[PDB]
Amino acid sequence: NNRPVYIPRPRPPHPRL
Amino acid sequence: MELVLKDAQSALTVSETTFGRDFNEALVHQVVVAYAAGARQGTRAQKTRAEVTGSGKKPWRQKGTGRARSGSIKSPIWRSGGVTFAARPQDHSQKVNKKMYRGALKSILSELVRQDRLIVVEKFSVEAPKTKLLAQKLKDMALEDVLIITGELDENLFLAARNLHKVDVRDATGIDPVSLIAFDKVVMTADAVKQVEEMLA
Amino acid sequence: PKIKTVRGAAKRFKKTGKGGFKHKHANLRHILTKKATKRKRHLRPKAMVSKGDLGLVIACLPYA
Amino acid sequence: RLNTLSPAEGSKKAGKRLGRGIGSGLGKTGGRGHKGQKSRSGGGVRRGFEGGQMPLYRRLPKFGFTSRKAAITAEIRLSDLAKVEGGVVDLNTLKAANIIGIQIEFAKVILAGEVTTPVTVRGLRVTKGARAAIEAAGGKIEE
Amino acid sequence: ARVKRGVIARARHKKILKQAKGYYGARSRVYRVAFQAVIKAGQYAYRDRRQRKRQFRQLWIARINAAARQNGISYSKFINGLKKASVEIDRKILADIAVFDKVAFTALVEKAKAALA
RNA sequence: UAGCGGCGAGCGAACGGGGAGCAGCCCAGAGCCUGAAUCAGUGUGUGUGUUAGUGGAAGCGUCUGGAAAGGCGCGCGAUACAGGGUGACAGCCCCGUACACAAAAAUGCACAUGCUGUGAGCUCGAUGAGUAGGGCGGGACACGUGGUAUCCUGUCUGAAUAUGGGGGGACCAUCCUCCAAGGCUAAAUACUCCUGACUGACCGAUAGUGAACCAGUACCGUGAGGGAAAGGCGAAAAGAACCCCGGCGAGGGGAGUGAAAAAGAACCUGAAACCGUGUACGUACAAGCAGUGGGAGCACGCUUAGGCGUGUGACUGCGUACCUUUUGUAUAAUGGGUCAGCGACUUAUAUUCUGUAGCAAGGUUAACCGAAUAGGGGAGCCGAAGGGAAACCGAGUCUUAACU
Structure with missing residues (x-):
């Protein structure tokens, strides 16, 4: 039971406070 | 010192240094332990993470995955492949000085005489290669676990005691500390005794 | 394998009777x-x- | 009796085992402290490293040279001088006694005392007191 | 010489869980939580072996103070009178006497009052 | 160790000694004598081994038990108690084991005897040229161009030939040693895809080969390639005839088999997390690491008739998890959903110190030999003498013209 995840995620506006 | 007989009642002269010296507990134990270690063969081995069948591909990417960082399927903390420190075939025999071996043997022989576990007799032989004859010869002497040491090895005595587990037949040259300690009684022939001092010196 | 002497050290220190070492200024x-x-x-x-650096010298040349 | 032999007291120590519980003493890094180069697996500095400062074996100048003649010379004691062979001693027949070695071709006799038997030495060198010692014993010197 | 630690490990876990019997939820079922609960109970037991002595001391003083005041004297005055009268009865007996034997306590306060005066 | 080395990190000989094993020849050519030894290939004969195998000793009665090989009592074999199986643990029930034998046919090995082919012995002569060496550029020798010998080579040159030439660590002279530019040669040495036997302080199904189960399979990838999980009924299937509920089901209750069916094939043992039914006690006006100290009541049992134990626990004092990392964490800093299993200071060779044992101005062998953990083997290593860069000197030495 491994099920590798190949899901990239969108780059949100970085905090850069 | 003087070694008495139980059959011929004949006096025997033997150096007291090799038969009447004190019993060195520490020295004898080291020789016995060394003898047991030399009996090993150390034929064993496991596979390290390099010798385990597999591939070096990383199971998953370093980052992004929600699980622990992994480098190979063969890591020791992984199922089916590992062994952090795999054993290799090694020699367990250890060095024992010649004098230390002789000293332990002299110490062992003296104490056997002190505990009357050593019996000196005349020539010990069997007319025919029959285990039944040897059993009878040892039965009337009230001996069941004995180590027969003879100056000259004869096939007739060797074959008679082959099927007797509790009985062993040996030559003076082929004498080891473990056999003397292990066996309840030791029977030495007159010839066998003489060669012992010569080799022990 | 046997230890390897630091060759550079062996050219600058000589052992003496009481276990010390002599060196050129x-x-x-x-x-x-x-x-x-x-x-x-x-x-x-x-x-x-x-004395302070004697221990360092001992490691460099364990044979000499 | 094979199950009665024991070793001398203090012959065994049982060794040190690292990272086996709290009560065992040296657990949780097993006596190598907290973070640092020395705490890492396989970490440490090579011999003579001083943290970047010029090592002692580099601050000092190399001196002298090796003499090949020194490896083919040896010194003979007075104690072992008389146990070579009868009462004659020379460059040869010392190798038979095995006190110089096959390769040695120069030898000297120094004052080590305990010389009784008068002996003759040919081809060797007796420094100052070796000459006196053998002469008292009854030896002689000739080249 | 491979060594399997199944038997020993199960013995240790059983011992801890047995000591955690009666705790609520995972504290009596799960070893990881039970071990913390058992250790904490050990700390509290050590601490409360000392608080018990002072807790009972406070209770005895309160009982004596109530009994002494009922007889018409403050606790501090009553104890001072006993010390002056050379009476070595401690608080535990004094509280016990006050609860059960009223006459004996009345004699004590009377003795304390005489010593003070 | 000597040396090499941004003289850094590191690399690291030889001479010499002790062992295993030993074997020396042929062509560059003519003559005399010509199977003359030794070799290779094909026949015959002896011995041995491999490929099928044969014989192979000796126990019974009672007790427990489903069943004994176990307990008890009395016997026998053993040149055979090495192993395996058999209803629990077998020297004497079975297969084997020590031991003694066996081959029509095919084969490897060591010999003797035939054939074929090159080929003995003596005299004289000859005795390897684009080579040695050199210039330039590289590489190999521990040796990185350094004072650098020696070897190999891409490029350009280029001898003497035995009254000659090479080497002996720049180089020269003298001495010593050898004869390149043509070849052949078993032994001691390295390894095991495979075959047989034997052994193991090696593993025992998350271990051991990835694979104990028809596994490199299923499965994933266009492809190279990657790559699992999954063992256990019982001594023997004797694997549940038959009856009943049910959908001519599934599943179940009887019956029967068996020592045992909560051994029924979803089958040895059957833990924990997790999920339930029953019983006792507590809980719907009471605030928080859920415990701890005190503690009434209730329900069960014990002797005594008072308590002791077991379970629960109203009420009450105190009390903000663990680990890690930190000057400092309940911290709202890190890590963990839980359980079970696995998971991290090891091993080899050297060096120093401590303890202990042997021997002692001596101690100890390595390889190897060895019917062998013995005994041989003392090659060698460490120590008893140091000083100096070294020659050298020596209980002294160095420093200095020499020491108060």
Whole structure:
């Protein structure tokens, strides 16, 4: 039971406070 | 010192240094332990993470995955492949000085005489290669676990005691500390005794 | 394998009777005109290795 | 009796085992402290490293040279001088006694005392007191 | 010489869980939580072996103070009178006497009052 | 160790000694004598081994038990108690084991005897040229161009030939040693895809080969390639005839088999997390690491008739998890959903110190030999003498013209 995840995620506006 | 007989009642002269010296507990134990270690063969081995069948591909990417960082399927903390420190075939025999071996043997022989576990007799032989004859010869002497040491090895005595587990037949040259300690009684022939001092010196 | 002596160390330290080490002083190579004769004279004889760095010397040359 | 032999007291120590519980003493890094180069697996500095400062074996100047003649010379004691062979001693027949070695071709006799039997030495060198010692014993010197 | 630690490990876990019997939820079922609960109970038991002595001391003083005041004297005055009268009865007996034997306590306060005066 | 080395990190000989094993020849050519030894290939004969195998000793009665090989009592074999199986643990029930034998046919090995082919012995002569060496550029020798010998080579040159030439660590002279530019040669040495036997302080199904189960399979990838999980009924299937509920089901209750069916094939043992039914006690006006100290009541049992134990626990004092990392964490800093299993200071060779044992101005062998953990083997290593860069000197030595 491994099920590798190949899901990239969108780059949100970085905090850069 | 003087070694008495139980059959011929004949006096025997033997150096007291090799038969009447004190019993060195520490020295004898080291020789016995060394003898047991030399009996090993150390034929064993496991596979390290390099010798385990597999591939070096990383199971998953370093980052992004929600699980622990992994480098190979063969890591020791992984199922089916590992062994952090795999054993290799090694020699367990250890060095024992010649004098230390002789000293332990002299110490062992003296104490056997002190505990009357050593019996000196005349020539010990069997007319025919029959285990039944040897059993009878040892039965009337009230001996069941004995180590027969003879100056000259004869096939007739060797074959008679082959099927007797509790009985062993040996030559003076082929004498080891473990056999003397292990066996309840030791029977030495007159010839066998003489060669012992010569080799022990 | 047997330990390898540090060859550079073996060319600068010599072992003595009581286990010490003698070495040449380290300020008598060049730029000698401006030095007083007293300081050059005192640097000529060999000197013993200090206690603090003795342990370092032992590791460098375990055989010699 | 094979199950009665025991070793001398203090012959065994059982060794040190690292990282086996709290009560065992040296657990949780097993006596190598907290973070640092020395705490890492396989970490440490090579011999003579001083943290970047010029090592002692580099601050000092190399001196002297090796003499090949020194490896083919040996010193003979007075104690072992008389146990070579009868009462004659020379460059040869010392190798038979095995006190110099096959390769040695120069030898000297120094004052080590305990010389009784008068002996003759040919081809060797007796420093100052070896000459006196043998002469008292009854030896002689000739080249 | 491979060594399997199944038997020993199960013995240790059983021992801890047995000591955690009666705790609520995972504290009596799960070893990881039970071990913390058992250790904490050990700390509290050590601490409360000392608080018990002072807690009972406070209770005895309160009982004596109530009994002494009922007889017409403050606790501090009553104890001072006993010390002056050379009476070595401690608080535990004094509280016990006050609860059960009223006459004996009345004699004690009377003795304390005489010593003070 | 000597040396090499941004003289850094590191690399690291030889001479010489002790062992295993030993074997020396042929062509560059003519003559005399010509199977003359030794070799290779094909026949015959002896011995041995491999490929099928044969014989192979000796126990019974009672007790427990489903069943004994176990307990008890009395016997026998053993040149055979090495192993395996058999209803629990077998020297004497079975297969084997020590031991003694066996081959029509095919084969490897060591010999003797035939054939074929090159080929003995003596005299004289000859005795390897684009080579040695050199210039330039590289590489190999521990040796990185350094004072660098020696070897190999891409490029350009280029001898003497035995009254000659090479080497002996720049180089020269003298001495010593050898004869390149043509070849052949078993032994001691390295390894195991495979075959047989034997052994193991090696593993025992998350271990051991990835694979104990028809596994490199299923499965994933266009492809090279990657790559699992999954063992256990019982001594023997004797694997549940038959009856009943049910959908001519599934599943179940009887019956029967068996020592045992909560051994029924979803089958040895059957833990924990997790999920339930029953019983006792507590809980719907009471605030928080859920415990701890005190503690009434209730329900069960014990002797005594008072308590002791077991379970629960109203009420009450105190009390903000663990680990890690930190000057400092309940911290709202890190890590963990839980359980079970696995998971991290090891091993080899050297060096120093401590303890202990042997021997002692001596101690100890390595390889190897060895019917062998013995005994041989003392090659060698460490120590008893140091000083100096070294020659050298020596209980002294160095420093200095020499020491108060």
